[PDB]
Write an enzyme that holds these catalytic residues in place. Structure first.
Site, PDB file in Angstrom:
ATOM      1  N   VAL A  63      72.331  61.209  58.068  1.00 44.43           N
ATOM      2  CA  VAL A  63      71.754  59.902  58.049  1.00 44.43           C
ATOM      3  C   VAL A  63      71.042  59.631  56.723  1.00 44.43           C
ATOM      4  O   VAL A  63      70.229  60.420  56.299  1.00 44.43           O
ATOM      5  CB  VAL A  63      70.825  59.809  59.206  1.00 44.43           C
ATOM      6  CG1 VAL A  63      70.348  58.382  59.189  1.00 44.43           C
ATOM      7  CG2 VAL A  63      71.604  60.099  60.473  1.00 44.43           C
ATOM      8  N   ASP A 111      73.424  50.704  43.992  1.00 43.65           N
ATOM      9  CA  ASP A 111      72.170  50.999  43.238  1.00 43.65           C
ATOM     10  C   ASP A 111      72.196  50.424  41.841  1.00 43.65           C
ATOM     11  O   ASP A 111      73.056  50.676  41.045  1.00 43.65           O
ATOM     12  CB  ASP A 111      71.530  52.416  43.069  1.00 43.65           C
ATOM     13  CG  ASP A 111      71.551  53.448  44.167  1.00 43.65           C
ATOM     14  OD1 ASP A 111      71.347  53.231  45.350  1.00 43.65           O
ATOM     15  OD2 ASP A 111      71.795  54.640  43.678  1.00 43.65           O
ATOM     16  N   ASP A 117      77.401  52.442  41.213  1.00 37.80           N
ATOM     17  CA  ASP A 117      76.237  52.534  40.301  1.00 37.80           C
ATOM     18  C   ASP A 117      76.182  51.482  39.205  1.00 37.80           C
ATOM     19  O   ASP A 117      76.894  51.536  38.229  1.00 37.80           O
ATOM     20  CB  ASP A 117      76.065  53.907  39.589  1.00 37.80           C
ATOM     21  CG  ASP A 117      75.695  54.995  40.529  1.00 37.80           C
ATOM     22  OD1 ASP A 117      76.751  55.474  41.157  1.00 37.80           O
ATOM     23  OD2 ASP A 117      74.534  55.251  40.811  1.00 37.80           O
ATOM     24  N   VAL A 134      71.240  91.133  42.901  1.00 47.21           N
ATOM     25  CA  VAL A 134      71.871  91.751  44.026  1.00 47.21           C
ATOM     26  C   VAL A 134      71.151  92.881  44.633  1.00 47.21           C
ATOM     27  O   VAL A 134      71.091  94.015  44.159  1.00 47.21           O
ATOM     28  CB  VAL A 134      73.334  91.565  44.222  1.00 47.21           C
ATOM     29  CG1 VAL A 134      73.765  90.421  43.287  1.00 47.21           C
ATOM     30  CG2 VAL A 134      74.005  92.832  43.793  1.00 47.21           C
ATOM     31  N   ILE A 181      67.263  60.817  56.408  1.00 52.45           N
ATOM     32  CA  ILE A 181      66.917  62.047  57.021  1.00 52.45           C
ATOM     33  C   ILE A 181      67.186  63.191  56.107  1.00 52.45           C
ATOM     34  O   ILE A 181      68.287  63.331  55.606  1.00 52.45           O
ATOM     35  CB  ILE A 181      67.792  62.208  58.238  1.00 52.45           C
ATOM     36  CG1 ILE A 181      67.394  61.118  59.209  1.00 52.45           C
ATOM     37  CG2 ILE A 181      67.641  63.589  58.837  1.00 52.45           C
ATOM     38  CD1 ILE A 181      67.943  61.270  60.606  1.00 52.45           C
ATOM     39  N   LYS A 218      75.580  92.469  53.235  1.00 51.59           N
ATOM     40  CA  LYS A 218      76.335  91.364  53.818  1.00 51.59           C
ATOM     41  C   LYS A 218      77.711  91.361  53.239  1.00 51.59           C
ATOM     42  O   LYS A 218      78.648  91.190  53.963  1.00 51.59           O
ATOM     43  CB  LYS A 218      75.596  90.036  53.838  1.00 51.59           C
ATOM     44  CG  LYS A 218      74.629  89.922  55.016  1.00 51.59           C
ATOM     45  CD  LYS A 218      73.365  89.087  54.792  1.00 51.59           C
ATOM     46  CE  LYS A 218      72.156  89.941  54.407  1.00 51.59           C
ATOM     47  NZ  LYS A 218      70.922  89.615  55.154  1.00 51.59           N
ATOM     48  N   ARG A 272      85.242  55.864  35.321  1.00 50.40           N
ATOM     49  CA  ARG A 272      86.128  56.981  34.948  1.00 50.40           C
ATOM     50  C   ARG A 272      87.545  56.950  35.569  1.00 50.40           C
ATOM     51  O   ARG A 272      88.141  58.021  35.657  1.00 50.40           O
ATOM     52  CB  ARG A 272      85.559  58.334  35.353  1.00 50.40           C
ATOM     53  CG  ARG A 272      84.450  58.951  34.527  1.00 50.40           C
ATOM     54  CD  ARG A 272      84.117  60.282  35.182  1.00 50.40           C
ATOM     55  NE  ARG A 272      84.011  60.212  36.650  1.00 50.40           N
ATOM     56  CZ  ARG A 272      83.428  61.149  37.427  1.00 50.40           C
ATOM     57  NH1 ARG A 272      82.873  62.260  36.930  1.00 50.40           N
ATOM     58  NH2 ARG A 272      83.386  60.972  38.754  1.00 50.40           N
TER      59      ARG A 272
HETATM   60 MN   LIG Z   1      75.360  57.426  42.830  1.00 50.31          MN
HETATM   61 MN   LIG Z   2      78.959  57.143  42.654  1.00 47.99          MN
HETATM   62 NA    NA Z   3      70.372  62.304  54.890  1.00 44.55          NA
HETATM   63 NA    NA Z   4      70.577  95.083  40.592  1.00 42.70          NA
END
Ligand SMILES: [Mn+2]
Ligand SMILES: [Mn+2]
Ligand code: NA
Ligand code: NA
Ligand SMILES: Cc1cn([C@H]2C[C@H](O)[C@@H](COP(=O)(O)OP(=O)(O)OP(=O)(O)O)O2)c(=O)[nH]c1=O
EC number: 2.7.7.7
Length: 327
Positions: free
Chosen positions: A95, A248, A184, A57, A98, A64, A175
DNA sequence: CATTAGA
DNA sequence: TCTAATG
């Protein structure tokens, strides 16, 4: 957790901004450790100074904190929140493909909007192409109800190809999770373990199969052990077509499944918590193995795992069903 | 933290 | 090769 909330939140806001809009990895790294510590701090921070006492800090940040404690705002956050240029970077980023790097570049050239992204699909590589293409579908949550049908099919072909394959759809879906982001699938085979110098086809055959039937629609990235694509459930008997989903699948040395599996199953916390334990218990856990700890500080020697159980047993814990790996 | 594209 | 993007 709630007492330090705003602070950590403006702090995170702050950090994120430098890292994306700006190429300030440092300041960005600043905000985070800070955001990290005040976060831990046991009491309502009441002023810069107080905060200031903290490691990480600085005078920078402290200042701030004051403006923020004083006025329930921050000029720099307001100014950024507004900044059209910085807005754009935030967005293109959505995207799949990107990143910040390309987000700036695009912006510069002037691709701010999605439509810009279109007219210039040429400037975009295949990933981002598909990224842009399934923009909507990609942003959508996956009803478990569909996850069930998906898992169903994958499972089947996997098997049709070679009954020998083992497959697990991991993640939250595993889960319990009412919905999922993407699917996955962990894969492994017996003829593929630690040593046994690959069998690329191992992955390949399957991918080929899933595409064969039209489950996989596109390839984002296919390598010898990690395939990353797009899928879709058969739009039934019309009127209702299915959204394109991120899927995936990865190959795994049979001798490192369950760990990997344990692992990818989560949750982020159950893991850590699990990991933190095996430690006391004289071990070590990681995405692929479980080594017994030695007093010289460290040690090695990969203990043999036959199921999520073994892993548990090792560290001598209570088998926890996926359902309760919540933390 | 390791695996893929791409240039 | 390195550098980005994903996870
Ligand atoms: Mn994943
Ligand atoms: Mn996932
Ligand atoms: Na992206
Ligand atoms: Na400090
Ligand atoms: C870590 C968390 C998971 O174990 C794994 C990455 O999985 P992710 O798909 O990144 O996350 P998730 O499955 O927990 O979330 P959801 O399906 O709702 O999007 O690594």
């Amino acid at each position: 957790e709630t007492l330090n909330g705003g602070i950590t939140d403006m702090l995170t806001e702050l950090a994120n901004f430098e890292k994306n809009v700006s190429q300030a990895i440092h300041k960005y790294n600043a905000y985070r450790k800070a955001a990290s510590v005040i976060a831990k701090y046991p009491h309502k921070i009441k002023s810069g100074a107080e905060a200031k006492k903290l490691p990480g800090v600085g005078t920078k940040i402290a200042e701030k904190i004051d403006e923020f404690l004083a006025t329930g705002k921050l000029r720099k956050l307001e100014k950024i929140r507004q900044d059209d240029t910085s807005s754009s970077i935030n967005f293109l980023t959505r995207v799949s493909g990107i990143g910040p790097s390309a987000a700036r570049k695009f912006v510069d050239e002037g691709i701010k909007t999605l439509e810009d992204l279109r007219k210039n699909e040429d400037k975009l590589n295949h990933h981002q192409r598909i990224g842009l293409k399934y923009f909507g579908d990609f942003e959508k949550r996956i009803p478990r109800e569909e996850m069930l049908q998906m898992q169903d099919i994958v499972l089947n072909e996997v098997k049709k190809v070679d009954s020998e394959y083992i497959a697990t759809v991991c993640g939250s879906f595993r889960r319990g999770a009412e919905s999922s982001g993407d699917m996955d699938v962990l894969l492994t085979h017996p003829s593929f373990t630690s040593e046994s110098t690959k069998q690329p086809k191992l992955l390949h055959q399957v991918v080929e199969q899933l595409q064969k039937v039209h489950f996989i629609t596109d390839t984002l990235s296919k390598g010898e052990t990690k395939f990353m694509g797009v899928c879709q459930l058969p739009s039934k008997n019309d009127e209702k077509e299915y959204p394109h989903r991120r899927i995936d699948i990865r190959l795994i040395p049979k001798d490192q499944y369950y760990c990997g599996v344990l692992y990818f199953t989560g949750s982020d916390i159950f893991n850590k918590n699990m990991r933190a334990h095996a430690l006391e218990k004289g071990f070590t856990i990681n995405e692929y193995t479980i080594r017994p700890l030695g007093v010289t500080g460290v040690a090695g020697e990969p203990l043999p795992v036959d199921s999520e159980k073994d892993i548990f047993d090792y560290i001598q814990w209570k088998y926890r069903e996926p359902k309760d790996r919540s933390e």
